[PDB]
Design a protein around this ligand. Sequence first.
Ligand code: SPH
Ligand code: SPH
Lengths: 193, 297, 297, 49, 245, 245
Amino acid sequence: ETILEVNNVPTNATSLMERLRFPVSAQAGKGELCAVFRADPGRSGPWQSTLLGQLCGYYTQWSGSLEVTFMFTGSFMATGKMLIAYTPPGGPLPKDRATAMLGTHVIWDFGLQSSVTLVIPWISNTHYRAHARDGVFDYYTTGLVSIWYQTNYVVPIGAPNTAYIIALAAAQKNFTMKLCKDASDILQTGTIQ
Amino acid sequence: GDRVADVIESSIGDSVSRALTRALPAPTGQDTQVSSHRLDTGKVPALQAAEIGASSNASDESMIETRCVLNSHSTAETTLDSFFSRAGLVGEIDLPLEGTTNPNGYANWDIDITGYAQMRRKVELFTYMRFDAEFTFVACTPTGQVVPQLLQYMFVPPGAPEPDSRESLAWQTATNPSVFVKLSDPPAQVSVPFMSPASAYQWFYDGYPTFGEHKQEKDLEYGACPNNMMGTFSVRTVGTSKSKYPLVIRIYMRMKHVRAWIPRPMRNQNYLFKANPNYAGNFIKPTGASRTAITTL
Amino acid sequence: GDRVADVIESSIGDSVSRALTRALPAPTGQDTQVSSHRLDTGKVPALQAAEIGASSNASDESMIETRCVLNSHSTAETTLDSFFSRAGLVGEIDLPLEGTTNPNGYANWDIDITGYAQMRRKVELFTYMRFDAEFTFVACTPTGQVVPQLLQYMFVPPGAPEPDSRESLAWQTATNPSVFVKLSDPPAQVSVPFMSPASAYQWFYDGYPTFGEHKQEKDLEYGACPNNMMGTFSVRTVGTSKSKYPLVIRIYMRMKHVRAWIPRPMRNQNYLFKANPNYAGNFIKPTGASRTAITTL
Amino acid sequence: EIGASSNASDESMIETRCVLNSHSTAETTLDSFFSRAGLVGEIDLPLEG
Amino acid sequence: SDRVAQLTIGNSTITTQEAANIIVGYGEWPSYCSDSDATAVDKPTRPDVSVNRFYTLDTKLWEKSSKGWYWKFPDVLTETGVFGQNAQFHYLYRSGFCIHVQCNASKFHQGALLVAVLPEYVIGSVAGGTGTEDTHPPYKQTQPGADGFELQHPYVLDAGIPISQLTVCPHQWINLRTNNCATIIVPYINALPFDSALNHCNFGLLVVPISPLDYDQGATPVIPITITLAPMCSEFAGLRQAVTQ
Amino acid sequence: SDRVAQLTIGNSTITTQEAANIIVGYGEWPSYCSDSDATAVDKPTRPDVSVNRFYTLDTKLWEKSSKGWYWKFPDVLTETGVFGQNAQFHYLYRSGFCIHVQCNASKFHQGALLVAVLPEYVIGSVAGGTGTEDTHPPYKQTQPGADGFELQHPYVLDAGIPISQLTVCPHQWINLRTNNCATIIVPYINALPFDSALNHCNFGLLVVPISPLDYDQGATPVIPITITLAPMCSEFAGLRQAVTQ
Ligand SMILES: CCCCCCCCCCCCC/C=C/[C@H](O)[C@H](N)CO
Ligand SMILES: CCCCCCCCCCCCC/C=C/[C@H](O)[C@H](N)CO
C-alpha cells in the first residue's frame, strides 16, 4: 500500500502537501458527490504517486484486480456513512447517487475500524490491457471510482467540522505485467555532472 | 441446492464445443479405385442439390469407368508455414541529406504490414492470424552502393517516449531493445514474438474503439483496431553532426509458427488506403478477363 | 449439461423452506422449578436489549426466589376452532308488504361477513383464513310471531343469472342449490365448503384488479379482492300473488376447520364502510381509557 | 494503522466465477528487468580542443 | 461478535459497526417455488446476480416534528434497473427481500425509530372528516413510488389500527444510544405462488419516530435516514411486451 | 423426412414444409465459455428463456431490379425486448444465433437468393469516385440498425471483394423452385471470450438475388422477404447503468 493522490489539484510548493488527502464535512443530506478518479495505474493522473503506478510505467501490458483502502482521520466523536462506487468500462460518469449505485459499490460505516477496502475487480474483454492515452486508444479504459455521501457527516458540540481522508492503493495477488519498456518521463534536463 | 426438475435436468453450463467434424491425416493425394458400369434405378449419385449449401460429393468411381491409380503426390507444400514463411517487402524509410520528409537524420515508422499489395493480399485471405515474425533491414544509398556508416535501430513499444530529434535522450535505450549495425555488415535480422493483447491479430474489425456521438470528426475510428497497434520503429544515424551519405532502408518480414482462422474472399480491386477497404467507385473492373461471345473461345 | 464451476456449485433451485423454529406440544401450562439466591458477576438475565426485536426471555426462576408448582392448566380453549366456532349475526333481509327497499317480495344479498362489527373485529385479527362454514336462517315477523308461510332460499354462484322478479325463470333451480322451508319449521341449516380460487380468503388486499389509468371513476377498485366475491343469496315468498305477512330474515354464520396466517393489529376505531378501512378523521379517539395524572390512580 | 496491506480478496466482497489463471510471472524477475544494455558514459577525442 | 456485520450479495456490500443482529421474517428464509405448488406451465426465468443486489432508493430528513413515512413493495423497484425491466416485461413475479435502514448520529443525540414490515398494508382515508363521505386514497397515497409518502395520523397508521401493537409484525428499533442500522429479511408472503408485480403490492415498510429527536444547539441538525434493499430468489414468468403501469 | 421441419426454442415455434436441411456454422454448436478461457472475475448472468427466443425484425420487398441488403449483429437486437435491455445494461456479451429467412412464392415464380454469413464484414466506401478522397462510411451505412441497408455495388459487396467467392462462408440458397426458407446456426465467433454488444459487431448477414425475379403478368407482384432470428447461450457481465449507444 502507498498513498494515492486523489486530490492532485494544487501545484505550488507552499501547498504541495494537501494533495495527499481530501476532506469531508457536514452537508445537506442529499447524496452529494465528494471525488472521482480513474482506475488506470500506468496512466497519467492520481496513480502516478504510487509505487505500483511507477513500476507499471515500465511495462506496456497489465492484468489483474486492484485494491484501494481509505483511512478516516476525524475525531473519535464523528460518525457518518459513504457510498464508494466502481463503474465498469463503457459507461459515462454517473450523474447522481441513484445512478452510481448500479455499479460495484461498498457502503462504508465509520467506527472503531478507521479503514475500509474497495476492491476493483478485473472486468475486461481482453486477457491483457495495453497502455492507452489521449486519442483513439482509450478502448482499453478501466472505469471510474466516485465517492458519494450516504447519510451525512455528523459531529457533536466541541469537535472540528472538517475531517480529512487518506487513500492507499495496491494490487491484488492475480496482478501481472508484461512487455518491459522504457518509462515515459526522463528525469534529466541537461548533463548530470 | 437444486430441487426443481427444470434446474436439475437443465443443460445450462455446457462449456464443451460439440464438433460435427474431425481431422484425419492426409500425407498424399487420394487413390483411385476400380469401377465398372451400373444400370439400376433408385440410386443416383449424379443428381445433387446445391441449395443445401454443401459441396457435391459425386466422385470419379460413380460417374465414369476408371482404373486403379496409386496416388503418391504429397500435400506438404500447401501448409500454412509453406505458404507464408517467405520474406517480402513491407516498409521503406528514406533518409535524405536535404528534403522535407526526413530532414533531421531520423525517422519513425509505425509497424503495419498493409502498406504493400503483395503481402497484403496474401495476409488478408484470413481474418485472424497468430504467428511469430522475422525482420530484416537492408540499407543502401539511392545509387545502391555500400558506405561506411553506423546506424541505430530502436524498437519503441506503445507508451514509450518517441524520439523527437537526433540528439533526444530516448536513445539511451536503458530498457528499449536496440541494434547498432554498420552498412558494410550483412543485414540485421531479429526475431519478434506474438505481442497482441488478444489471442490473434484481426485484419478486419467491424467496430469503433470508444463510445460517444459518431460525428464527422469522430468517424475515422471505424475499422481501427487498437490491438494491432504494435508501436513504432525508429532509425537514426549515430553522431552529433549531420551525416555524409543519404540512405534508404527496406524492411522485409517473414512469418513463422502460423495459425489462421475464418477464411474470406480475396481482394479483386486496387488498394487505396491503409487499414481501409475503400475502393475506387467509378472505376470498378471485373475479377477476370472477358471475351466477345459465350459460344466461342 | 453443467460444466462450469459456478453452475455446478450453484444453489439456485432450492425450493425447500429453511425453518428456524419448530412446533412442540403444550397441553398444559409450564411448570415452575425451585430457585435460590445467586450472587455473582458476568451472568445477568435481568438486563436485555429490546432493540433486536425479540421478546425478553428472563423467567421467574432467574429473578426471584420461587417454589415448585405443578401447573396443570389446560390450553385447549384458546385454539382457533374454540375461538371461532361460534355463531353470530352477519346479515339481515327485510321483506315488507309496502316499501321501497324490497317491494316485490324478493331480495338479493351479496355474501360478505364485514357487515357487522362483532364478527368483523374477530375475523380481521388475521390476514388470511381458510375454513368451512355453517349458515342458519331464522325468520320471523317484525312483532316476532311465527306464521304459516313458505319461503325459498337459493344460492347463486358468480356467473349465474340473478333473478329479477318473483316470477323469474331462474327459480327452476335445475342446477343451483335451493331450500324450501316453512316459518313454522326449525331454522334451516346448511354446510358450505371453501370456495376461493386461491388457497385462502384475504380480508386485506393492497392492489387493484385491472390495469389502466387510475382516474376518479376508476378509484373504488382499491382493496376490492375478486377472490372474496362468493356470489349472491336470493330469497322469495313462494306464490304467484303477493304475500300476507311481512318477514325479516337473519343469517348466522359459524366457522369450522379453520387455519389462519399473518396476524395484524386489532381495529380501534368505529367502522364506516364495507370492505373499506376508512375511519372518521376528525373524531379520532384513544385506544383505551384516560386518567388525570400519571402519578395517581 | 497497523502498517499491513489489507487482505480482503475478490471472493469475500463480490460474487465471482472460477478463472483458471495461467499468466506467467517470469518477466518481472530481477534479471528480466535489469539485463538490458544502456548508455553509461561517453569519451570524446577531438583533434583540437 | 454481534455488533459488527457485513452483508454481501451480487456485486454490492454493506458494512456496519453498530448492528443489532438480523431479524428473519416469521423464522423463514426466502425460497423458490416447488413443483407441487407451482400452477403455471411455462418455464420461469431466474436472472440471479443481475437482480439480486442492493439498491439504494432515497434519503429522508429526520426532524424534531417528523411523523413518519411508508414505502410499498415492490413498487419502489418497479422502475429501477434490470429488476424493473424484468418486472415490466413479465406478467408474474415472486421474490423476497433484505431491508437495511441507515441512520447515524453522535453520542450527544437521542431518539428512537420503529422499523416494521406489515403485509397487505391497505391505507384508509379520513372519509371526509365527519365520516359520511365514501372516499378512497389517491394514487400518490396508495402507490407513492420510490419517493415514499408521509403519514398524516401516525397514531392510527392511516388505517384505524393502533401503532402500539405494530410490534407483532417483524420489526427492529433504531435507538441512537445503541445502534445505527436495522436489517429485516422477508420471505415471500402471499396466498398465490405467483402474482403481478405492478397491480399487487405485497407489504409496506413503516418508519415512525416514537421518541422525538433532541440535541443541544451547536450540534449537527441534519440527520438523514436512508433505505437500502435487495431482492432475493427472484422469479418471473409470462413474457410479453413491456407495460408502463 | 428432410423437407419438413419445426424449430422450437423458448416460447416460440417455427414450422416449415419446404426446408433444405440445417447448416451449422463451421461444424460447431454454440456453447458457453469455459473456466480456462474466461478472464473476467465477476459472475456472469445467463437469463435463459427470456432472451433465447425467436425475434421477427422486419420485412423487405423483392422486385425485379433489387440489388440486395445486409444486417449487422447484434445491432439488430440491441434495442429489442429483454435481450436489448440486458445488452444495454451490461458491458460484456457472448452468444450465438439461429437465423431463419422466409420467402415464399408460387410454382409459376422463379428466382434465387444467396443467404450468407460473413464475420467482421467491414463496409468500404467508394472513396469519392475517383479514389483520391479519404472517406469513411456514415452511421446509417456502418450500423443501419434493425431496418437493414441496401447494397450499392453488390458485385463487390461494398468492400472490393467478389461475390462469386461468398460461398466459402456459411450459406444457403433460396431457390423458389425447391425451397422457401433457409436456416444457418452460428456459434460465437471472436478472438476474445467476451466483447461489447454496442461498439463491436461480430458478423453481417447478406441476402443478394443472383437470379432475377420473373413472373407473367397477372400473378402476384408483391413477394416479401422476412428475417427471423434467435440468440443462443447468451451471457452478460459488467453490470452498470444503461447506456443508449
Ligand atoms: C531492435 C529491434 C528492431 C526491430 C523491431 C521489429 C518489431 C516488430 C513489432 C511486431 C510486429 C508484429 C507484426 C504485425 C502486427 C500487426 O498485425 C500489424 N501492425 C498489422 O497492422
Ligand atoms: C341453499 C343454500 C343457501 C345458503 C347459501 C350460503 C352460501 C355461502 C357462500 C360461501 C360463504 C363464504 C364465507 C365468506 C367468504 C368471503 O370471504 C366473504 N364474502 C368475505 O367478504
